[PDB]
Design a protein around this ligand. Sequence first.
Ligand SMILES: *[C@@H]1O[C@H](CO)[C@@H](O)[C@H](O)[C@H]1NC(C)=O
Lengths: 375, 491
Amino acid sequence: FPNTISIGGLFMRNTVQEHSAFRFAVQLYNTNQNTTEKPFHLNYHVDHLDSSNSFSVTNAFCSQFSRGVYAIFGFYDQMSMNTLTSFCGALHTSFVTPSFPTDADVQFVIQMRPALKGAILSLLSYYKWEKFVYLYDTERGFSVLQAIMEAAVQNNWQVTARSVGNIKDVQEFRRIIEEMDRRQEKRYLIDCEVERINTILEQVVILGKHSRGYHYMLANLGFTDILLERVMHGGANITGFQIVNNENPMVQQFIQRWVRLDEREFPEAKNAPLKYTSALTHDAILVIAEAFRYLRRQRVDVSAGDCLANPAVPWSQGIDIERALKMVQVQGMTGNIQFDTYGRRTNYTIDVYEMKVSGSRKAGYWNEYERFVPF
Amino acid sequence: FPNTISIGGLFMRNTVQEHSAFRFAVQLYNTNQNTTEKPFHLNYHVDHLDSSNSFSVTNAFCSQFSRGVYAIFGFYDQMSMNTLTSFCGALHTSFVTPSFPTDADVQFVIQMRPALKGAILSLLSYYKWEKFVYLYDTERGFSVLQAIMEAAVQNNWQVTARSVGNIKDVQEFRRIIEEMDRRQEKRYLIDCEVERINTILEQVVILGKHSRGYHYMLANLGFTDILLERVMHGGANITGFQIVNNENPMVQQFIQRWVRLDEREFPEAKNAPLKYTSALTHDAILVIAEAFRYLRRQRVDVSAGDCLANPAVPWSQGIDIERALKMVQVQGMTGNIQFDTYGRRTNYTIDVYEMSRKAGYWNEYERFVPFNRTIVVTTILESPYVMYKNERYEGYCVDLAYEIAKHVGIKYKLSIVGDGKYGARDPETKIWNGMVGELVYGRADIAVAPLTITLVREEVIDFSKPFGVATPKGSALGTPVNLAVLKLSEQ
Ligand SMILES: *[C@@H]1O[C@H](CO)[C@@H](O)[C@H](O)[C@H]1NC(C)=O
């Protein structure tokens, strides 16, 4: 086993807090004084992507690959998903990511962002949403959209689906909302980005659609990031989902030790709310450390060239590392962390917040086996 | 100047006829004996790549780059567009493509497909389309969609835009068409792929919307690949766009030589109609030949390593090759061929077909040179209001509907609700049932029936004065029906 484990980091734009969480988690692992908890020193090579120039993304990935790396933690969007996923799958290099899970079942990628599809379907069945308006964009994949369509077909729902990803003018949102209200539509499932959700909520506030007779289900982890101050005052239902628990002791101690770091080495940390992606980054560091500790425990022999070496020969140990990254069962800031054969999270819990009352109240939780437990 | 010029080629799925056209055009260039338009041999490398796997695309591009090429002809999809465009613009290697033009301004990309936004806007202005349904797909870019949106905002149009690129169930197409027909939409602008256009058109044929009075504008240069026999047999108007004119002598010569090619060596020839992408491939070969002939005539110096070598070394001769390729002006099978600073085609002509006959032609400078309702009445089977005997029913409400229609002057058709209920909102699902549900959800236009004027219903539909007669809220029949009810109450 190597005396030092080096990993890579691929950070796209607007990931300052995620970068700070990555550095802080690596430092937390490194400063542990227990030889059993720290059998190897962990280093990282951090590079920043463009995500619009595939040449730049490939250059950064190949610079990471040329130097010795055992795993790559990073982020991708819809424009850089395919390049990184394909390169990692072909070169047998594990890619640990907090980004949206891939629609296709692909290997050598560990996406520890739980899928909202099951929770969304369970809440739709529980609330009995047999007719609603589904406003979606395709910036996080098509899994939720396909699941909604299949559920509507099998359950004979009345789902009015609208793709709002390509809308640049707010009057289009106003027209959509007015048309929906003309048809007496009271229930909206908004599977969009945080900024698009904010724009839609501004439009519904402007049109006065935030009254007590409307329900908005925001299908987006990061409930604390959406601006809901002005929609609460109208009395409308707002269902949200989260994976970070504030009263979790591990989350509590991380926050306690995390809000007292100077904003010169860890920017966007102290005077800023903790995004769920930072918790996923901390959990990713935990998963990597646990997997490599297990590899050392079993005495598995793990120890580059260039990306494009046609005929490409993958390095043999990589598969083992993938297995080590997929058999872990760890407890992190998002709760239980386990992965299936495709790298997707399994046996996870998603907290559901109703927050219709003044403030935020956690209406219940969702689990794969016991579907939805309300309070 | 080298005795031979080597070019790369990147082909994908459903690109057999285009590959045959590429090979045949290269053979035609190499088989000339004048020695003036053929001063050098033309060698080609060909790679078939899977666009869904970026690793394979990068492998193919880098293999061709390392082999040594002066330009890459080929196709890109919405997934492989970014990779190929970035790799060509960063390594200063020209990419000649007959695929969709890039929305953004990029360098070292020579796009052989002319843009359709100008022709579509001019045809919309000519036909006076103040209100239409735009079904878009966004598999050839977003330029047309944003152009339509800006034109609608500036000209105060009523465009009902729907994205049909994520639809896999034909019932969704049926529901969209039914919803558009309910709101009295006659004109459709379908900017989608050929297969999606065919699916939409067959759904239209099944729904019987292909009759007279309906206009369908197909925003795709694939008019010959669209199955629309039944659509035009119904009497509807179909406006199409083309770039290949069969009356062009060069096109005729190419076709007469093309239909006599051995299918073993040249698959998809003399078996299927010549796709416009094959014509663009032939014209791209002509463009490459003319540009390199210009380079040789001007005595411009012309000459590798791996793609990914930090810091990247741009090709010194790439700028000259791109400049020569972007100043070419040739008469190809698609007409005049010229390129602007960003590689997009300029000064082109688009033939507009009204159907088939050539309605006219669109050019950038000379813009475009050319050459009642059956209202649904919903009722409920309840004596003596509606009783089985439009001729199948009699009762008070049938006579009331007849009188109201005579005062309004409309043609109607009675239809009793399936569930046989009045309006009621389920507290759990918030769904209205009965006649009020039909009116709210747009499946009916008026409800002459014993429907009590209540507060809960009044908030969702318009009630005339008691006789009340219900109407969907905000419709154009509210005041006429209210006045008719009042006048009938007068007598
Ligand atoms: C809002 O929530 C309340 C309490 O859960 C529920 O009774 C009401 O029907 C909801 N409104 C909707 C779903 O429009």
